Amino acid sequence: GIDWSLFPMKLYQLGKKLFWDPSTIDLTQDRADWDKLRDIDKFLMVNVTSKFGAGEEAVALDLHPLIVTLVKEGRVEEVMYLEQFIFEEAKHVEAFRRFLDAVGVKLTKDVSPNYAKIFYEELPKAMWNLNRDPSPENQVRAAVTYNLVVEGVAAEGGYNIFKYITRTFNIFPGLAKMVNYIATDESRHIAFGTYLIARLIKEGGESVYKAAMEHINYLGPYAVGIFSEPNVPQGVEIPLKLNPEVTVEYAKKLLNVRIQAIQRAKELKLEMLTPKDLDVIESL
Amino acid sequence: GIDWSLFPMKLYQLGKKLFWDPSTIDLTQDRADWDKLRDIDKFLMVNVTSKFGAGEEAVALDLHPLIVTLVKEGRVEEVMYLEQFIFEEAKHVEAFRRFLDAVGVKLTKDVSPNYAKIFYEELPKAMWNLNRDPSPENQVRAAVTYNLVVEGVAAEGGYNIFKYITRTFNIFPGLAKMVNYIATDESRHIAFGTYLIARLIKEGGESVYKAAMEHINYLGPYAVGIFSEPNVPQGVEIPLKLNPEVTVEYAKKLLNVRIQAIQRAKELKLEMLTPKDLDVIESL
Numbered sequence A, B: 001g002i003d004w005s006l007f008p009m010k011l012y013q014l015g016k017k018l019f020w021d022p023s024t025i026d027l028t029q030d031r032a033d034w035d036k037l038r039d040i041d042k043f044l045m046v047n048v049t050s051k052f053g054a055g056e057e058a059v060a061l062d063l064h065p066l067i068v069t070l071v072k073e074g075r076v077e078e079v080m081y082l083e084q085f086i087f088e089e090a091k092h093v094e095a096f097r098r099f100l101d102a103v104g105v106k107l108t109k110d111v112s113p114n115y116a117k118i119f120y121e122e123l124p125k126a127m128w129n130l131n132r133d134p135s136p137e138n139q140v141r142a143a144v145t146y147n148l149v150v151e152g153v154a155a156e157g158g159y160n161i162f163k164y165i166t167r168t169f170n171i172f173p174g175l176a177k178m179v180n181y182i183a184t185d186e187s188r189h190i191a192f193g194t195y196l197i198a199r200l201i202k203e204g205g206e207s208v209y210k211a212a213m214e215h216i217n218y219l220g221p222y223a224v225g226i227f228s229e230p231n232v233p234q235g236v237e238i239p240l241k242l243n244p245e246v247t248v249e250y251a252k253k254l255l256n257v258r259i260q261a262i263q264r265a266k267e268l269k270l271e272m273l274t275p276k277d278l279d280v281i282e283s284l
């Protein structure tokens, strides 16, 4: 009794068409490119990649209450997509772990408080609050946290950091290929979160809409502050010629795009919804 | 810092080589074959397939505490394989759900007490006891339950039921293809459970070995009784010419094979371990 015309199933079949595996990606050149990086460049690299490895793992693990919530409500279509969502997240964890393994590399809170606030406090709190009370308001706060904030701002802003480094120095071709594939999966993740927040709001009314706008405003400063957390004492040089103002500015603009996506979710036609309507990448 | 020579990573790369997706399997003939079944045959079919759909979903969901336990212990290799394990389980849920959807079909406890004892009481109890106390004894009881019992006896005995029906009546070619692929994944699931029980016993001593033997003996009668639970009042005819004694006898023998696998796990060389040493299917 599956409705294949539902929007989650559209993204579900898309995730199957655009399937990839990080074990088929050669990291030989990436290992050679590791020697091209100075110590302050390697620190910046480990900083971001480990926050990706740990963040994607936090999402893959902390998303268990939402899936249990939806299966108790008998929403088989949305449960089937979250099962694809979770595996893709763990697939992203493998991708970053294979890169760290290839370069020979074997979360402080004290130097990264914004990152810890999101992934170690606010993400597990919003998710495991569903075990306490799976209300529509807690479900929209969960969706806002892991999807629009963790992925829509933190992950997407991280992608911008990787793309700048790979094109500026012509390094890490395997990682650049990984980020493209990861950003493709994440495109469907944002669309499902937009749809999910749309369904909760259209079924729960103004009470659900307020909870989404209050939660994303509350998380906003921490999500943007994630990109103001380089390594330790800075030093004289900026690693890998990054522009700190543009990195932070991009996240702020991402945050506003996610805020406006909640405002547009009130009046959104869910039945005629297609991935192209949510600007979803439909080709690898 | 991944050890690719470890036994979990061997099965991990095997799961990637032997990857399959149930959406590429044609069920057109299966829908036509549904009309070949009498009402008592359709009931038997829905009986087993829904217990598979619900059982595989119970395993995919209730396995969250074990993965959280292993990541807190820093066992990255075993966590990476459980991530493949969980997705394959949800992939099995999709396979059975696509078959039920193709045949147009849209767990009673009262008529299936043995099935409910395993999947609705003993499986969630052994798994969520890790959240209470992730001791080595609780970890081996968890492994015995979901792996050696749920998969080694219940799932494997279910496969025997499907294979008999498909070859006796020459029906359901899509389902027969699915069961072959599912039984291939499950081959690696049993090997990892054997390895995991072996590591816990060799690191925990006699206390862990006793917990594994006490738990599988306690679950044994319920696992075998699962195959003594046809539909409702039986009637005059046996559905699909099944032999009830041979179906039950096969499960009993499966149970003893799993018991002897725990006894052999005490003296098992884990470093030289290969999939062929655990009789793992290595080709599709």
Ligand SMILES: [Fe+3]
Pocket: A089, A151, A155, A185, A186, A189
């Ligand atoms: Fe994502």
Ligand SMILES: [Fe+3]
Pocket: B089, B151, B155, B185, B186, B189
């Ligand atoms: Fe299995």
Ligand SMILES: [Mn+3]
Pocket: A056, A088, A089, A092, A186
């Ligand atoms: Mn991801």
Ligand SMILES: [Mn+3]
Pocket: B056, B088, B089, B092, B186
């Ligand atoms: Mn399975």
